[PDB]
Symmetry: D3
Amino acid sequence: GNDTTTKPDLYYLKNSEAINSLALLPPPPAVGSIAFLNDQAMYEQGRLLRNTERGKLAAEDANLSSGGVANAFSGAFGSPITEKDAPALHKLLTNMIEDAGDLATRSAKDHYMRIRPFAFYGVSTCNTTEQDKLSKNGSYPSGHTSIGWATALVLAEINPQRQNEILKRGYELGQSRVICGYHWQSDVDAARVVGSAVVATLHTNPAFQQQLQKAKAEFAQH
Amino acid sequence: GNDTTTKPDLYYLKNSEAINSLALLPPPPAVGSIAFLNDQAMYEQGRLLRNTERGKLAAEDANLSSGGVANAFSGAFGSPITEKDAPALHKLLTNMIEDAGDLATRSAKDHYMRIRPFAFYGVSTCNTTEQDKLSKNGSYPSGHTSIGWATALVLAEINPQRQNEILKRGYELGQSRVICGYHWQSDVDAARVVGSAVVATLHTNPAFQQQLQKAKAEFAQH
Amino acid sequence: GNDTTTKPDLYYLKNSEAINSLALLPPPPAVGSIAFLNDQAMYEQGRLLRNTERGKLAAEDANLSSGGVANAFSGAFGSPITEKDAPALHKLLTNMIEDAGDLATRSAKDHYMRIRPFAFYGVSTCNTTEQDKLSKNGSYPSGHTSIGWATALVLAEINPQRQNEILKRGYELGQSRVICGYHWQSDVDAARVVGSAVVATLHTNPAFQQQLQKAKAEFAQH
Amino acid sequence: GNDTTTKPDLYYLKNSEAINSLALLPPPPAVGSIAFLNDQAMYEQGRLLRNTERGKLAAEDANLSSGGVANAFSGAFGSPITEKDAPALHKLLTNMIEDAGDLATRSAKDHYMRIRPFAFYGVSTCNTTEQDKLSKNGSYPSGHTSIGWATALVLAEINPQRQNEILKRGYELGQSRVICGYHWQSDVDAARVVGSAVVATLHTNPAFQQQLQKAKAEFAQH
Amino acid sequence: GNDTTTKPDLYYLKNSEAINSLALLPPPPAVGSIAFLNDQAMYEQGRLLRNTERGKLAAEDANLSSGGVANAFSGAFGSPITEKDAPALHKLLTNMIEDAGDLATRSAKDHYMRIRPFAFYGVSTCNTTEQDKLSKNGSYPSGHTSIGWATALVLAEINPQRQNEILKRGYELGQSRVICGYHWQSDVDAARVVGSAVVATLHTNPAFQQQLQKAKAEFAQH
Amino acid sequence: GNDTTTKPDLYYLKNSEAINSLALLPPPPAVGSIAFLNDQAMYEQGRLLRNTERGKLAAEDANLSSGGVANAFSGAFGSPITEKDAPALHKLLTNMIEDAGDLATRSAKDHYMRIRPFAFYGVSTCNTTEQDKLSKNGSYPSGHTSIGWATALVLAEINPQRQNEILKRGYELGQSRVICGYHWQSDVDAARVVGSAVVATLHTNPAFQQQLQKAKAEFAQH
Ligand code: MOO
Ligand code: MOO
Ligand code: MOO
Ligand code: MOO
Ligand code: MOO
Ligand code: MOO
């Protein structure tokens, strides 16, 4: 799959620096397990939440694909994160996205091919934009959750004084996937183990440690 | 409670610079939910494991406070983290035991004072040593857990070529609690969240920065 | 809402003299608890029953408002409660439909606005007639239920030699909701509590006293 | 079993006026049913509550056997209910006790012989006074719950202006049995159907309708 | 009932020699039990495999009716069972089918009249050929699983060089009904008991005796 | 392994002809599944009957080892199976025991090495005679249930006037292990598959052939 060598504006890492989720993450809950039963319970809870504000916020949370992530984190961060208002931070996030959404979650996703609620129950997610595209994507672990958690983790280092609010968005971001219908609760949960793992590799990657430096200081006068 | 102001040999952060564990994390599984039911079967599973190698390891992953966490990883770091071999590493790892163990959890540990399983069942742990001091300590979320992960995201940014073994052991240091009857599965899972959120905060700390730096320089050596 | 002041043809009590359904009753089973899981298997069970005699009866136990509750019992009262045969009985039974149906439940119905099952599942009821008017009405606790029981404790103190049949039918008038997909088992159970608590209050009401008296005198007749 | 003809100071009814619980109540949850699983869940929840105030109040709630019931309801009722302060009410309650605790619950109790938690798990209730005596008593339905509910129902007619507080004690009384270890939650729940049923028969029994009259007026000047 | 006195080419035993499945077998799980909760989970896991190599096999396994059974064992038997290759054989398998499928399931089936998963969920089976005919034929126990097992045991007593094989197929041959959705895992497990039982009553019939020998013989030079 | 080449009076088949249970059988439920949750519920229901007519029978059923099996079928067979009444018979039953009990369970057993309920809960069985010996003998599948079934099928092919009977006993003969607490319901259900399978491999052995005839013969005048 891609990596920095082919999509250097969505990754800071090579497939070789990737975290092996397959080896690090426990198998997903099986069907006929009590844990799955809870996944199913979490979906229904989630699904009934959909026609609530938390629901609307869940649909408009499936969108992070491009710059959207820095959009989802605007309020929590405090200052707005736009290409125009904070492009150093805005690039930092935009660049690390697929490292979080694809590298960190690839081995397991692909190895297990867990199915997805919407496909399991045969009912549409709350935001069908990427549905048909993800419909063939391993459900476990979740990409957005990994992204949400890693970004938030990264943002918490820039604006520590606002980490609780940030971190919560990060977390809340993963949960929106449960409400929406794209991931079972276990997908969302495992995603955070991996998503915290990449932010570690990223702290060793020079390209990241420099954009982080530019994002830090760029906000430190803004 | 304490922090870097009262015992700066185990904290970097101040009660002020800590994560709102209670605000970030969801509430533990309640008795009577499919969730707890799973926590239970988990405990059973861990129990039957106690008398096998894993149980053996589970036995040992209980001692850390002294900086045994450092020695828990020495094996998967490919180099031994000790006070005589990796002074900068070893110190770094110990000055933050409590930033990750107490500050990262304390807020929600106290607010839920959830029942540990050795106490919920009467049966004792796989390691009774701290069983006492802990019986009157909230179960949610796990502190050993949030220290195995925290101390892993840090040893993995210091030794990326071996991040998968590091990260795995840190994940395992947390499973042990579950096999030792010390924590419910849910306490361990929820602990990796705060565990990962503290490192973000740590990276914003001069004292941690410094030593993390020295740790890296010195690493080129041992 | 209404009461004996706005529509005294269906109430005896005033919003003031009503039970705190919301304060007396525990919270409904939440999605994700073994409790709801049972509510579910119950619904399934009721569903498969719909196409049998019980289902047949379940079908009919849905119409009451007009005073069909009176006619629901006529069979188990051994005498027919009608407007032409037991005027005092029939009136008594109807002037309190709403003391038991609305006032007895309203408080917690609104506060939980719990999801009925035809709506939780998409599938429609065994009797679609009131399915509309009710879809936007809290499910917890059941009002038909709290009227089948209330109207039974009253017909059983009026005809004690037949109290077991009376009480059984009133219990059945409530099970029907469960078989009709109108209410969850838990809505029905919790409804017998408020259903029974209203009669206590009714016995303290002059208007109810009077008619209850006339009902008894007249009973010696038909 | 006894009745008014042999224990006229604990019953107002004859075995012939008794409500047939066996016929009116649904079978109790079986072992291997989801409902039982919830009973078990409710016990553990209950048991962990025992070393709480609600717990202490649960132990000192197992005592209603003689005049105790009117004691349990003192606060909720407002005025004290003692042989010396309100002996007309105090007799009314003392006399109707076994009608509620034994008649209403006899056919089912004896027919099913459901076992009890304390005996099921082999651990002692919170108040072992009647343990060995009840240890051989059908667990389903519960006597105290029937008593608690019926008294409270009856008390609510004397002091309507305080029914919510009364009724709650009534309800809370049944629940204390779950916390204590004598009854499964299903026992406590079914008990209230029957307990509301007897208060109906009692409203047809002359001896009751006169003591009620004396209790009403005796409080209506007190 | 039907049998050899009315359909001698699919039957060997008469009704007088049918085995009482109703009696020898426990009742099927019930909506409400924990085992029906697992009947459902296995229905779900079955669904997920309908479109895989296994689901195709399942679909084909739905066809035993006429020689389908022989042709379902050929791969496992080691050679081909055809009316013109293993004639003696093919003949045997052909006339016992109904013994194992009808006779050895009628009582349980007819009495219980259990809902099939497909009718339960309202979801076409995986090989609708029979779905209608069987849509109103009791689910508990599975007649296809019986044949599968019955015949697998008789063939094992013929070609013992590969019993593991001939047996493993017979086993799976019943599982297919769970994947196809015609039966619940429980009707399948049950079906094997009556399935093995009839092979006993069959060793009791002279005709079966005759044939089977013949078949065993022919296996010599073949 | 042991067999007829080392213990010819309890064996008929050699190891080379043992049936592969490991292979022909699904794995035993696992702590975490819904079916092990039901394995437990059946363990609990088993316990409750230990002190009843059935529990005594269960206790006695734990003794087949030597002629216990013959003496466990005598009531159902219709006559007495004694070394001096139904000698030919008694002999057969006596030397197949190990085929059905050891040979037809070794692989599954040895491989899986499943925890017995008694060891699981730490609660003496209902007939501790064997408990020690078996305390470290894999639980999945049940060897006593195999014998029970195996032998019940061979006897049915002898005294077909009462197969329902001879069979119902064999069935129960395996259930006893669940009430006694030596096996989980699941090891019992599994055990019957390998139990019926061996009776096939047995009809393949000339010796079994010889004996069984003899036994069938003797049943003529007896
Ligand atoms: O992208 Mo997920 O893997 O649908 O969050
Ligand atoms: O220290 Mo825990 O909180 O026993 O892992
Ligand atoms: O009226 Mo309900 O509240 O549909 O029984
Ligand atoms: O008296 Mo119960 O039947 O222990 O409440
Ligand atoms: O024939 Mo079944 O009864 O659909 O296996
Ligand atoms: O012999 Mo078992 O393996 O205890 O039935």
